Design an enzyme around this catalytic site. Structure first.
Site, PDB file in Angstrom:
ATOM      1  N   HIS A 245      -3.755   4.275  -0.811  1.00  0.00           N
ATOM      2  CA  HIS A 245      -3.284   4.998   0.355  1.00  0.00           C
ATOM      3  C   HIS A 245      -2.320   6.133   0.014  1.00  0.00           C
ATOM      4  CE1 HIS A 245      -0.852   5.301   4.129  1.00  0.00           C
ATOM      5  NE2 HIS A 245      -2.066   5.479   4.626  1.00  0.00           N
TER       6      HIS A 245
ATOM      7  N   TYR B  62       4.409   0.053  -4.336  1.00  0.00           N
ATOM      8  CA  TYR B  62       3.778   1.217  -3.653  1.00  0.00           C
ATOM      9  C   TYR B  62       3.845   1.317  -2.123  1.00  0.00           C
ATOM     10  CZ  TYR B  62       1.951   2.915  -7.967  1.00  0.00           C
ATOM     11  OH  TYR B  62       1.766   3.548  -9.169  1.00  0.00           O
TER      12      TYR B  62
ATOM     13  N   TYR C 209      -2.719  11.948  15.083  1.00  0.00           N
ATOM     14  CA  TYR C 209      -4.157  12.181  15.151  1.00  0.00           C
ATOM     15  C   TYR C 209      -4.676  11.206  16.197  1.00  0.00           C
ATOM     16  CZ  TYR C 209      -3.879   8.021  12.174  1.00  0.00           C
ATOM     17  OH  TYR C 209      -3.512   6.767  11.759  1.00  0.00           O
TER      18      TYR C 209
ATOM     19  N   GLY D  92       5.418   1.383   0.932  1.00  0.00           N
ATOM     20  CA  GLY D  92       6.690   1.960   1.294  1.00  0.00           C
ATOM     21  C   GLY D  92       6.711   3.359   0.711  1.00  0.00           C
TER      22      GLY D  92
HETATM   23 CA   LIG Z   1       4.070   4.254  -1.110  1.00  0.00          CA
END
Ligand SMILES: [Ca+2]
Ligand SMILES: [Ca+2]
Lengths: 123, 123
Positions: free
Chosen positions: B48, B28, B73, B30
């Site tokens: 995330h 995940y 941000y 990356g």
């Molecule tokens: Ca990912």
């Protein structure tokens, strides 16, 4: 950079449009400055101008194409307080401190509307 | 944006180069992700990724050309803690929260080097 200084002042003075309210006030608030500050707000601006002059003398700032008006740095407003980021390099961190000090000084002194767009004969 | 997420993770893990260490790890961590997280770090990355998917569904984000990887941000690192700025608009504030949560999750779970550059047969 100027955008961050704008956000900083709103952090301490949530009712202001800083680029309107604190631009072109007294002898110092605004691009340039000369002569004797007309009041305490103007004196905040004089200190801030001197802090920007000291920043441009630092070797860290001298390396950068950016000047204190365009040099973006990072900071947060949270609960109306300003914290300059540890991620900032030496130049951008000095500038962040200048701007933070100015925003705080602005929020603690009287605003005299009659010094707004002061005729620079007085400086 | 990705640059800020980088700075956030270094805030919590000062010894890391995040874009090296936490890129291309597990199923995940990356660009992309599929299948079952290989460990807890990978699970941080799955959360995330799901937070970024939820951000792109918000009307505030849909208005912006920028995606969560390029949407800058503002936040500060101070004393190794992350604070997302009140100056952030709704989209950029949601993204800042995603990234902050991921940086914290990263610092609290084991790093298994053998999941580095995991062969995506496993996902
Ligand atoms: Ca990912
Ligand atoms: Ca000035």
């Amino acid at each position: 950079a100027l955008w961050q200084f704008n956000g900083m002042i709103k952090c301490k003075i949530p009712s202001s449009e800083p680029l309107l309210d604190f631009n072109n006030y007294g002898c110092y608030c605004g691009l340039g400055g000369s002569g004797t500050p007309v009041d305490d707000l103007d004196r905040c601006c004089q200190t801030h101008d001197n802090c920007y002059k000291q920043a441009m003398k630092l070797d860290s700032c001298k390396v950068l194409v950016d000047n204190p008006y365009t040099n973006n740095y990072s900071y947060s407003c949270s609960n109306n307080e300003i914290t300059c980021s540890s991620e900032n390099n030496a130049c951008e961190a000095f500038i962040c401190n200048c701007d933070r000090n100015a925003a705080i000084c602005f929020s603690k002194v009287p605003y005299n509307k009659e010094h707004k767009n002061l005729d620079k004969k007085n400086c």
